[PDB]
Amino acid sequence: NQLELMLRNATNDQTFVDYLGAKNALYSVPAGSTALTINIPARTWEGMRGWSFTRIKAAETPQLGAQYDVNFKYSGSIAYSDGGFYLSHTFRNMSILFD
Amino acid sequence: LYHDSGVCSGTLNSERSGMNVVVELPDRNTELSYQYMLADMMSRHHYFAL
Amino acid sequence: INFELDPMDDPTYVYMLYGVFDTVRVNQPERNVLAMAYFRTPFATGNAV
Amino acid sequence: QPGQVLSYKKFLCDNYLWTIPFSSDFMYMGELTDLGQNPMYTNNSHSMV
Amino acid sequence: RQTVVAPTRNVTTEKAQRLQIRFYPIQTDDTSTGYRVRYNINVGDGWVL
Amino acid sequence: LTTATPRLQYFHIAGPGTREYLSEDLQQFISATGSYFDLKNKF
């Protein structure tokens, strides 16, 4: 009861951060295309930690926020859900232009 | 478990106020987040069957 | 963000991850009163009323 | 046989022009909507998709 | 021209609340002449149904 | 409305720190019961 009454106090309440700490956006790249542009509208970028990125096959990734993905006809290792990344290569260069 | 899927999301709340406190976003990756947490917390060659 | 890639043989996604503080703190003032307020510092998803 | 039939639930709605009101509770509470005067959108620039 | 204006406050929760809730039966007890269903309509504080 | 917090100290993104926002009795409880019932990962 001491711990309970001491944890119900406002100034000391539980705070959690998701360990990934990343907003996950998938940008489609067709088969033969070799370039991609990510257009992001204006934002206040308050406290951005940085960028992290690989390319994942479309057939190996379920459609996000899906109760049931009817096109998902693959049952190997979803590199999106786990850390099974294998296409960190095939990345020539990258440019970032805040404006 | 259905993580980060709003259409079929989980539900945690008190009974007095049936207001769900778990909001799941399609743009967060709960499962890869747990992957990274576990990998940073310990070496991955360990086989924990539980 | 402009990317140049090696041309693969099948459609692929580019799994871009930003650096966000997708935090939450839990407010439990009384018995069976559970309330959490979320926050994601670059891409907060909260909207007005 | 009953296992050799299907179902094709469908609708047609002509001359309607689907409407999504910019109101918090999705009802009509005034022409100047509930969220049309909230100083999250009116006073701050947002880029909807 | 005159315009009616929404109440813009004290009319809709800013909290994450479900617009529409489905209840699935706790008990079924299917019988030969009927199909019973038993639910548990949980209306928490701050809700009116 | 009685707190007026800069919205980043609220979520401890730029806050003072765990050693100076938990109650001193809470910190004592965490230190005493720290060998078997951890609480550091919750703040």
Partner: peptide, 16 residues
């Protein structure tokens, strides 16, 4: 509970 009078980038307030 937090009050967030920010015109951009508000909190979620799952609450209850």
């Amino acid at each position: 509970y937090p009050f967030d009078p920010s015109g951009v980038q508000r909190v979620q307030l799952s609450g209850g």
